[PDB]
Symmetry: C6
Subunit: 66 residues, 6 copies
C-alpha cells in the first residue's frame, strides 16, 4: 500500500494539497488526519472528505516519497 505513506508525508510535513473530487471541484488545505475512509482537511474549518469522492490528491510541491 501507498496511500498511508503518501498522506502521512503530506500531513507530517504540513504540505498543502489540492483535492479534486469526483464531481470535479477542488478542495485546498492541509491533511490533518486520515483513516481508511476519510481525510480531514483543514483551513478555515476542518472538513471530513470521503475517499470514495476523491479522484486525485495533488501536493503543492514535490514530496520525497518512500
Amino acid at each position: 500500500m501507498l496511500q498511508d505513506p503518501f498522506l502521512n508525508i503530506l500531513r507530517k510535513e504540513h504540505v498543502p494539497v489540492s483535492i479534486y473530487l469526483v464531481n470535479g471541484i477542488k478542495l485546498q488545505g492541509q491533511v490533518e488526519s486520515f483513516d481508511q475512509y476519510v481525510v480531514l482537511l483543514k483551513n478555515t474549518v476542518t472538513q471530513m472528505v470521503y475517499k470514495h469522492a476523491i479522484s486525485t490528491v495533488v501536493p503543492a510541491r514535490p514530496v520525497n516519497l518512500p
Copy 2:
C-alpha cells in the same frame, strides 16, 4: 480502519453544529446531523432526510470545533 467518521459526526450531532453536506454531484445540503450509521446520515431542516454516505463528498461544519484532543472518554 474506520476511526474518524463516527467521532467527527458524533460531536457535530452532540453540539448541534450546523453543517454543509456536499453530495458527489455538487448539491449542497444544509442542516443539523441527527443520527448516522455505517451507511447513511440523517440530516434535519424542513424534514429529516436520509443521506447515503456513498453520495457524500465532504461534510463541512459551519464553525470549527475531535482528532486533536489528548483525551478520549
Copy 3:
C-alpha cells in the same frame, strides 16, 4: 441499523417521498418495497431504483424512528 427502519416507516405509513438521484433527477412517489440493493417506487408505474444511485431520501412529512 437506520436505513431499514427509515424505509420501513415510509412504506407502512404511505409517506410520499422525494428520492434524489446522483444524476440530479428527483423521483417522487411512495415506497412499495425495498431490499438490500433496490427500492421499488410506486407512481403511475412501479420503478426499481438502485440505492447506489440514490443520494437522499426526503420524506414528505417527518419520520419518527423508535
Copy 4:
C-alpha cells in the same frame, strides 16, 4: 437481503415488458430486457447492449408491473 431485484427483472424479461433504463449519466435507454445476471443487464433494441447495473439509476417499465 437481496430479494426483489431478480424477481422484478425476470418479469420484465419473461413478459417482454418495454422498459426505460435511466443511467447514472442521465442517459435514457429503451428496449426489452433480454437477460441479466448479478452484474449486467442485456437490453435489446437494434442491437443487444450490455448495461452495467452499477451504471443504472432506475428501471421504469412502460406498463404497471406490480410485485406481490
Copy 5:
C-alpha cells in the same frame, strides 16, 4: 451470478466487432475489444487503452451479434 459479461465481451473480441463504450459520465469510447479481465477492458484503435469496468455504463456492438 457472473455469467454474461465474458461471453458477451469474448464474442466481440473474437469477431473484431467494433463497440461504443459509454462511460459513467456519458463519454463514448469506440474501438475493438482486445482483451478483458475481472476489472478492465483493453480497447484497441489508435493505441490500446485500459478502461475500468467500474467506469463503464454500456457496451454497444456496432452491429447485432449473435449471443
Copy 6:
C-alpha cells in the same frame, strides 16, 4: 490478470500516459508506482490518483501485453 501488467509496462518503460478521470479531467504524466487502490502519477509533482475515479488509461504510444506461451 491484465491491469497490473499493463500499468507495470507503463511504469518500467516510462511511457507517457493520459489518465482520464470520471469527472472528465485528463491527467498527463508517467506512472511512478501503484497498488491495489491508487496510482502515483508524476510530472511537476507526484499526485495520488484513486483507481475508483479512473475511467481510462491512454498511453501516448502502443502498449501490448505478451501472450502466454503454452
